[PDB]
């Protein structure tokens, strides 16, 4: 039955737990909160413990548990569980719990007892809750004029992001922020209105989880009237569960202060359907270099003296691969201190995990439809700063 | 009979007329209430019925998304003019989110979409 | 140590609260301990005097050390016993709430020591005359089972929950067929005349969750003939429409249960209505309504076949129920509504969910090897979705053509020049090996096969294996067909395959090519060039015991509860 | 040297947050909340040598206070996770077994305390006595 | 003043955050009320005025106002005010010029000040501000109080530490001129809490001035000796002062090892009694006395390391650190594997290291925390060289096993590189490759595979040992899907060196065959061919395969093709194009 309400907030922080019968706590955080690339079922077995959850207004509702429970009754209960908090308190929000800490345990213990959900109709519960909860025109759009009438209606919205990343070399993410924005090529007739809609990645020196809009926007569905042609639509930053694109592995071997062992591993972290492109890779050396032997099998590599720093560029790096390269290093004789390796590449996705999952156009005088509307979408993501500790 | 779609918070405007939105009253509706869209197939009601019992308060029926008995303001995207049966008469939606107004409009486009397109099935 | 004091800070400001003796304080500071567990600041010291506020007679403070009674009965559960001697004082004090509230908190505690502290009160809390204390007792004996207590004395309870089961009000039968459900892992007398009949006169009254527990016992129930099994379906049938999304599906678990029987074909007509309606639910709901369809349009197909209009894609439903509708709408598409389908996944092939896309332009090739009469409307579907030109819908359709091509040899041969024409734009692995096969087969067509693939070759490195493979096939096959123009390809791809990769699987596949062609090229059309076979759903052994789980979670996964 | 000093509680309400970086008004608040979301996961059983965003962060439990001292990946972590103990007796012995409201009750004599002994990120005083000696001499001032 | 205590009484018992935000902004229009409508506060009332702006702008809120008001409280003449009115200008940092020469008039009337409790109030200001604004003006005259002798010395701690502050935020604007000579000379000063900020002073100066600060060298070392070789002020638990026998040790770190011979007479026989006193026993059992003792070594080992002078004292520290490998405490073994990383490199104690490869070994498998066990496997890599190769791979191996889902991603990429680079000969480096895939297999590259199998191809004594490896690593149930590869291919071509008879064979790759992916499935119907012409009498248990409708109707193109061919290579009636065709292939160039 329920083993247990997991009331989580955005950050992944355990606001409300109870628990009938805690490694369940974090094997829901590491792996539906913070999921990087799976596509999110509702209700998923993680290592032989069942995880359901619910979201209402960036609340995550897990009810975790073992057994062979009826799944339509739990996803019915973590509703009627809301419309009875949503009676006390209006809104789910995480200022609204963290106010009522002591209303949803007494909830928590009438509405259900041992996992078996009871008699929750909110006019019952009055009798048995003693608690109270603590409670809280357009006339003329002015970016696109009257009369576009284009041959063909089209929509090329395409998500540019840029990924920076500073990773230990022991493989520990430090820093990873991704700022990306979203541009469409409008070339829609009329004066349509978009519905853009997303999924749930975004929250609408030091990176700030951010989101702007375009003055067109109106605000979990994006609204909106395209201006002409070309506008950017959309731009944040975001710097939760990033899809990082590449691992790098700095094994580097320093001999005394003669020579410099340095071996550089590539690991792509995506899907082999997916192809990164324009893959540079810059492996700095140091200052007093007198001469490198570079011995890479797969790309072009070169010492560029001028740089101080072993170019290693490879044209293209299909997902799940990986590739190696050495360099005896020689120098010339203070210790050296180490820059990061830094690394440049394309891929054709969003390394943010943002995905676009529904555009419709509707206008209302001189019909067309959304089917009427060839829409494209080209995910593009791109390196920053994208660095590995060395 | 099937569900379009159905959403609460809409609100009756009063015509006194084109058809611009600052023209009306704007400020108190005449009615509010949640709204129903079915579909008794080929003809497309639209039904105002109140957020607690059920009562039924106007009905129209569409057969025509750009013909008259709908009909979306000129100034506005969220604020229309529908034509309802009784007797002909005119009364006033207007409603609160865009997405309210958008998905309105969607879905009495995607039945008459289907509704053009089993009379092309009709022909093969 | 450091900032504990025991003298100053929090603690000594709510010990002088919880000390204060009058109740309008008392009532303000435990809520400010309750909220100050959960942070998890350490208020273990504050334990004994919170249970100093359970003697009064308020009854909103005693609901308030419960709450501090109940986190310590589950998380530090021998602190919890300390205050044992108070609970059973609880448990004969009239305003029957507190009642309950104490058989509630003591099942919470996982030590051997309540047994002989709960084991009598609740004796006299299941033969309570308020039966809001009955609806917890009957659950604390399945809490007490759970506490390791195989203990006899429970099999002397267990005597009184199948008494609860003929009991007056519905909401105590709610619990005891709940737990009696939940004991019986470790019973459940099935009584024909008595037992069924009172729990279907139970199932008609009770909650919306009570009706959930019945009829998730009535899934472990076996008739005696099949005129029983028809006076059972015959009040199981008013349950298929009630506002829950929970009650259908187990008022399905047993129906499909029961259907071991005139009635077989009308209780069909009657089990497709909610099971369409089951839709109109919020999206996680549909997930369990769709994953439980999924097993019914394999099992009996006969129920929901003329019902494909309700299980169309809309924009705005989750991907979760995008990709199901999806694949439920294959499993119903036949003869008659294919032309429904293919107008429909066209239109979600003009979307721009890129993982929706290429599976919606996939299930048209699930259409075309399902449907056999509709390959036309099929290709006529893909050569228009190739016309739009989009790069992540041509990269899938040239993929899917190329089922159709195996499945149906010689007859949609002529759409490959409508193709080729975007051969620039293929640049995945799948989609370039897809491409390499229509030129492959077909080289005896298209006549200048001999540079196509010598396009490819130049970059015959930096590719997938399944390319490198599929190129190497396709030359050998342009070779065997032609051994007079494309021989000078064959010693390029040969000796890029063998002299050059270091994969054994490129590079065995290369030799066994070259010794074929070097010994007996009239042996090897007979080999390469042979007509290849034709190409073309849960396993029956596990299909049917799915529907016996059919609104629990085994069904959700397509997985047997063993696996759990 | 030391980049910030973050006394803060374990629900996450910061006691002391003394800043040595220029930092924004928002970059101040995200760098303390993602402090909390490392300190108060990890026992006692763990290193007190977090690998922070670009640099380190050495914390030390006090019984549900964590006193945070953020430092730069070339100085001496053994020495810093001592300057924090170094300074919580100082706190100790000028409030006379210090509870966790002396530090919001008297938060502008924590900030006497923190510029006494960790002055423009760097250990200013090491004594207990000298500045104890120099901050009972303050107090009668 | 108790007027603040009754405020945050009120706001910390607030019900709610609402309730909070209506208190807040509820004292705020008080606040403004009274510095706006001005009626005089009598000092101290501005001065609780003031602090409940400081605790509303600490609990998170917005303050737009009260500079104007707390630059009034700069002028007092009480240290209480002072207090207040310096800490609400350096925690609300402000842009508006007309404040920031309003300010630096207050800081110059408490420089000119001869008060050390002003002058330590106004260096605090300057120090936590730090602006450019501040530091123009500020540049010229705190170098004048560090150096002119009647400062008190409580002063020369904090100006010595604004100059630190000033010269980080606007190096050019603080120039090296008559100020370099003296603060040299505070290394003899009487306190060693000046000589604390001075040596913060002389680190920082001398990372940009290396030849102007040399004189510190002789003066640094001369006051070590004083200390390490001995204080009752600055006794750590017994440890005599720390934090200046570390910040004195880090300032000898910028320099190269010292040009006049007796101070290397001096810095090595104090580098000597700190690393004597590591072995002795302990004067308290206290923690904290176990840091303060050893962060005084972990200073005095990274000296050594960084002139890598004498050779006598890398031996000694190395032994010294495999001491806290075997420590109860988590820090002490976290730090020794850091350092010893940096001292395996060096020529003078890479001999010297390898001495400890059991005692990591055993700290690898024995840690519970993974940040310390991922320093352990960083010094295995930089501990191995070829007289210790083979066994630390083969400990790494054996680690690997049971190791968690953690670390076994960079195990798998150091023992494949360690195999490669220090392979005695080929035939350990199939046996240790085939396990690696055996052990690890899901993570071991592709590029991993091809040189298992090239070694194989090439080489004639690994074709019965790499044929029987795979055949006991497939017998698992479990075993990882690699292997089925590279098992499913030598098997194929070396299968008959071990025939165990070849009915097991075909009915173990056949059992592995299903659950697998297509070139998994590819490259076993490239075996089930092999066998058709090494083993004659397992043909016809092989067509039954390759005619079943799982295999000649297979939806995906590669495997189709692959069983109608090597279907019709054994069904044509043909014997010598069969042995011909799949005859033992050459070896790889």
């Known amino acids: 039955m329920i083993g247990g309400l997991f009331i989580y907030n955005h950050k992944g922080e355990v606001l409300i737990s109870r628990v009938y019968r805690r490694n369940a706590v974090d094997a829901f955080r590491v792996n539906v909160i913070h999921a990087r690339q799976q596509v999110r079922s509702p209700v998923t077995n993680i290592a032989r413990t069942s995880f359901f959850h619910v979201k209402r207004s960036n609340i995550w509702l897990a009810a975790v548990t073992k057994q062979n429970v009826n799944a339509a009754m739990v996803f019915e209960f973590l509703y009627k569980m809301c419309d009875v908090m949503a009676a006390y308190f209006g809104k789910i929000s995480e200022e609204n719990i963290k106010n009522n800490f002591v209303l949803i345990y007494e909830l928590l213990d009438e509405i259900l007892d041992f996992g078996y959900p009871q008699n929750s109709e909110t006019g019952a519960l009055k009798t048995f809750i003693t608690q109270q909860g603590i409670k809280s025109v357009t006339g003329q759009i002015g970016w696109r004029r009257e009369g576009i009438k284009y041959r063909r209606n089209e929509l090329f919205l395409d998500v540019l992001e840029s990924v920076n990343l500073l990773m230990s070399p022991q493989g520990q993410v430090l820093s990873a922020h991704v700022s990306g924005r979203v541009v469409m090529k409008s070339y829609l007739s009329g004066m349509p209105e978009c519905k853009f809609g997303m999924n749930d990645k975004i929250v609408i020196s030091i990176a700030i989880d951010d989101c702007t809009f375009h003055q067109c926007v109106r605000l979990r569905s994006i609204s909106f009237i395209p201006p002409d042609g070309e506008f950017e639509l959309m731009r944040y930053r975001t710097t939760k569960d990033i899809i990082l694109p590449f691992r790098v592995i700095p094994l580097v071997r320093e001999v005394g202060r003669t020579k410099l062992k340095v071996k550089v591993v590539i690991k792509s972290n995506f899907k082999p359907s997916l192809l990164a492109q324009k893959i540079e890779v810059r492996i700095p050396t140091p200052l007093n270099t007198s001469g490198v032997q570079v011995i890479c099998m797969k790309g072009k590599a070169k010492y560029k003296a001028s740089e101080n720093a072993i170019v290693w560029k490879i044209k293209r790096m299909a997902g799940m691969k990986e590739s190696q390269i050495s360099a005896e290093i020689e120098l010339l004789p203070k210790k050296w201190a180490r820059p990061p390796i830094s690394m440049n ?21 001189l019909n067309y439809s959304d089917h009427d509307v060839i829409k494209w979408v ?13 | 009979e099937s569900v379009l779609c159905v959403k609460p918070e809409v609100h009756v405007y009063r015509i006194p007329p084109g ?22 197939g080929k003809v497309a009601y639209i039904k105002l019925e109140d957020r607690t019992s059920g009562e039924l308060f106007a009905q129209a029926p569409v057969d025509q998304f750009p013909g008259t008995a709908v009909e979306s303001v000129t100034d506005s995207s969220r604020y229309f003019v529908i034509r309802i049966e009784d007797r002909r008469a005119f009364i006033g939606l207007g409603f609160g989110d865009r997405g309210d107004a958008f998905d309105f409009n969607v879905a009495l486009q995607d039945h008459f979409k289907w509704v053009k397109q089993q009379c092309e099935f009709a022909k093969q | ?78 602190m919890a016993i300390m205050a044992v001697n108070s609970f059973v004082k609880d448990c004969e004090d009239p305003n029957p709430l507190i009642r309950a509230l104490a058989v509630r908190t003591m099942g919470c505690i996982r030590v051997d020591k309540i047994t002989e502290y709960l084991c009598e009160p609740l004796r006299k809390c299941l033969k309570d005359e308020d039966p809001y204390v009955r609806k917890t007792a009957a659950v604390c004996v399945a809490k007490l089972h759970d506490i390791n207590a195989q203990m006899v004395e429970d099999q002397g309870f267990l005597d009184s929950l199948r008494d609860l089961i003929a009991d007056s009000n519905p909401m105590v039968v709610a619990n005891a067929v709940a737990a009696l459900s939940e004991i019986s892992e470790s019973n459940l007398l099935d009584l024909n005349p008595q037992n069924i009949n009172k729990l279907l006169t139970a199932l008609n009254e009770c909650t919306e969750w009570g009706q959930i527990f019945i009829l998730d016992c009535l899934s472990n129930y076996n008739p005696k003939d099949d ?33 071991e029987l005139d009635y077989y074909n009308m209780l069909l007509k009657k089990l497709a209505p909610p099971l369409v309606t089951l839709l109109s639910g919020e999206p996680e709901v549909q997930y369990v309504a769709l994953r439980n369809i999924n097993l019914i349009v394999q099992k009996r197909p006969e129920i929901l076949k003329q019902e494909i209009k309700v299980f169309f894609v809309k924009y705005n439903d989750p991907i979760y129920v995008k990709l199901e509708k999806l694949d439920i709408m294959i499993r119903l598409a036949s003869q008659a509504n294919i032309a429904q389908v293919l107008a429909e996944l066209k239109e979600y092939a003009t979307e721009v969910d890129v993982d929706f896309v290429r599976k919606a332009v996939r299930a048209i090739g699930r259409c075309a090897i399902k449907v056999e009469q509709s390959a036309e409307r099929c290709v006529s579907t893909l050569l228009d979705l190739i016309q739009t030109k989009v790069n992540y819908v041509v990269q899938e359709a040239i993929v899917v053509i190329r089922d159709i091509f195996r499945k149906y040899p010689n007859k949609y041969e002529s759409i490959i020049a409508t193709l080729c024409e975007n051969l620039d734009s293929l640049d995945e692995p799948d989609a370039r090996a897809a491409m390499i096969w229509i030129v492959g087969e077909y080289a005896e067509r298209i006549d200048n096969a001999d540079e196509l693939l010598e396009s490819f070759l130049e970059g015959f490195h930096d590719e997938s294996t399944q390319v490198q493979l599929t190129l190497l096939t396709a030359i050998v096959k342009l070779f065997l067909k032609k051994p007079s123009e494309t021989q000078e390809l064959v010693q390029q791809v040969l000796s890029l395959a063998t002299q050059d990769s270091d994969n054994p699987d490129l590079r065995d596949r290369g030799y066994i090519y070259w010794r074929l062609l070097s010994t007996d090229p009239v042996t090897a059309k007979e080999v390469v060039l042979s007509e290849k076979p034709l190409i073309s759903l849960i396993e029956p052994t596990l299909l049917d015991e799915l529907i016996c789980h059919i609104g629990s979670l085994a069904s959700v996964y397509h997985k047997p509860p063993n696996a759990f | 040297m030391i980049r910030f000093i973050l006394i803060q509680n374990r629900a996450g309400k910061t006691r002391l947050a003394k800043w040595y970086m220029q930092f924004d008004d928002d970059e101040k608040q995200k760098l303390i909340e993602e402090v909390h979301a490392v300190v108060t996961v990890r026992d006692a059983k763990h290193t007190n040598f977090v690998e922070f965003r670009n640099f380190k962060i050495i914390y030390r439990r006090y019984a549900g206070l964590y006193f945070c001292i953020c430092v730069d990946v070339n100085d001496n972590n053994l020495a810093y996770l001592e300057a924090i103990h170094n300074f919580v007796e100082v706190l100790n012995e000028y409030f006379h077994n210090v509870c966790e409201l002396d530090l919001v009750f008297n938060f502008y004599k924590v900030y006497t305390v923190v510029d006494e002994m960790f002055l423009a990120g760097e250990i200013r005083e090491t004594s207990q006595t000298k500045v104890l000696k120099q901050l009972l001499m303050l107090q009668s001032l | 003043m108790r007027g603040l205590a009754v405020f945050i009484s009120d706001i910390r018992n607030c019900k709610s955050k609402e309730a909070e935000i209506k208190r807040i902004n509820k004292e705020l229009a008080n606040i403004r009320s009274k510095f706006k409508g001005d009626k005089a506060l009598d000092g101290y009332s501005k001065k609780k005025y003031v602090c409940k702006l400081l605790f509303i702008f600490l609990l998170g809120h917005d303050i737009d106002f009260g500079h104007m008001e707390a630059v009034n409280l700069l002028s007092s003449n009480r240290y209480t005010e002072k207090q207040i009115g310096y800490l609400f200008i350096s925690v609300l940092v402000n842009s508006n010029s007309e404040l920031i020469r309003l300010i630096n008039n207050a800081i110059k009337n408490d420089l000119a000040s001869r008060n050390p409790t002003f002058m330590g109030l106004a260096l605090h200001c300057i120090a936590n501000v730090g602006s450019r604004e501040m530091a123009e003006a500020f540049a010229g005259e705190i170098p004048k109080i560090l150096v002119a002798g009647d400062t008190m010395d409580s002063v020369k701690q904090s100006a010595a530490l604004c100059l630190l502050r000033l010269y980080r935020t606007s190096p050019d604007l603080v120039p090296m001129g008559d100020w370099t000579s003296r603060v040299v000379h505070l290394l003899n000063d009487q306190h060693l809490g000046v000589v604390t900020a001075a040596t913060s002073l002389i680190t920082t100066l001398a990372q940009k001035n290396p030849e102007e600060f040399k004189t510190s060298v002789s003066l640094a070392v001369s006051r070590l000796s004083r200390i390490v070789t001995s204080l009752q002020d600055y006794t750590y638990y017994f440890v005599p002062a720390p934090w200046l026998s570390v910040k004195l040790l880090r300032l000898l770190q910028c320099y190269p090892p010292p040009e006049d011979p007796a101070v290397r007479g001096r810095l090595t026989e104090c580098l000597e009694t700190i690393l004597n006193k590591a072995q002795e026993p302990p004067k308290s059992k206290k923690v904290q006395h176990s840091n303060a003792k050893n962060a005084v070594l972990f200073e005095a080992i990274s000296l050594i390391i960084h002139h890598d002078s004498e050779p006598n004292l890398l031996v000694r520290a190395c032994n010294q650190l495999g001491q806290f490998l075997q420590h109860r405490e988590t820090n002490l073994r976290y730090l020794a594997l850091e350092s010893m990383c940096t001292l395996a490199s060096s020529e003078f104690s890479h001999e010297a290291v390898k001495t ?26 930089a501990m191995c060289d070829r007289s210790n190769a083979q066994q630390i791979v083969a400990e790494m191996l054996s680690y690997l096993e049971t190791a968690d889902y953690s670390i076994r991603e960079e195990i798998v990429l150091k023992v494949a590189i360690l195999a490669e680079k220090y392979a005695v000969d080929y035939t350990w480096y199939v046996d240790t490759i085939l396990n690696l895939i055996r052990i690890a297999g899901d993570y071991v590259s592709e590029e991993v595979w091809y040189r ?6 090439n080489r004639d004594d690994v074709q019965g040992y790499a044929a029987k490896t795979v055949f006991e690593a497939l017998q698992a149930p479990a075993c990882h899907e ?79 093709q692959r069983a109608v061919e090597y279907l019709r290579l054994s069904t044509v009636a043909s014997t010598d194009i069969l042995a011909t065709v799949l005859e033992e292939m050459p070896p790889f160039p």
């Open chain 5, 482 to 560: 690699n292997l089925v590869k590279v098992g499913g291919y030598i098997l194929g071509e070396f299968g008959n060196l071990i025939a165990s008879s070849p009915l097991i064979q075909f009915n173990l790759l056949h059992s592995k065959f299903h659950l697998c992916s297509v070139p998994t499935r590819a490259l076993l119907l490239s075996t089930y061919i092999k066998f058709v012409n090494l083993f004659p009498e397992v043909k016809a248990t092989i067509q039954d395969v390759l005619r079943s409708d799982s295999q000649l109707k297979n939806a995906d193109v590669e495997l189709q």
């Open chain 1, 345 to 365: 590449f394309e891929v054709p996705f969003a390394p943010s995990g943002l995905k676009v999952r529904y555009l419709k156009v509707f206008e209302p005088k």
């Open chain 5, 452 to 457: 298992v199998i090239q070694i194989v191809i």
């Open chain 3, 1 to 78: 140590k450091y900032f504990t004091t025991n003298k100053k800070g929090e603690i000594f400001e709510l010990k002088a609260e919880l000390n204060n003796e009058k109740k309008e304080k008392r009532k303000e500071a435990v809520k400010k301990v309750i909220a100050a567990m959960t942070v998890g600041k350490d208020v273990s010291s504050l334990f004994p005097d919170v249970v100093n506020c359970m003697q009064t007679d308020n009854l909103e403070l005693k609901k308030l050390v419960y709450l501090y009674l109940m986190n310590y009965a589950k998380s530090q559960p021998d």
């Open chain 5, 356 to 381: 400890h490869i059991e005692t990591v070994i055993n700290a690898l498998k024995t840690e519970r925390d993974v940040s310390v066990r991922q320093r352990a496997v960083d010094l295995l890599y």
């Open chain 1, 378 to 390: 080209r995910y593009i993501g791109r390196s920053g700063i994208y660095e590995t500790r060395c």
């Open chain 3, 227 to 259: 005129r029983e099994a028809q006076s059972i379906c015959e009040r199981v049938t008013p349950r298929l429409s009630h506002a829950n999304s929970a009650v259908v599906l187990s008022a399905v678990k047993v129906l499909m249960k029961f259907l």
């Open chain 2, 19 to 40: 058809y611009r939105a600052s023209e009306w009253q704007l400020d108190q509706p005449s009615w509010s209430g949640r709204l129903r869209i079915t579909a008794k």
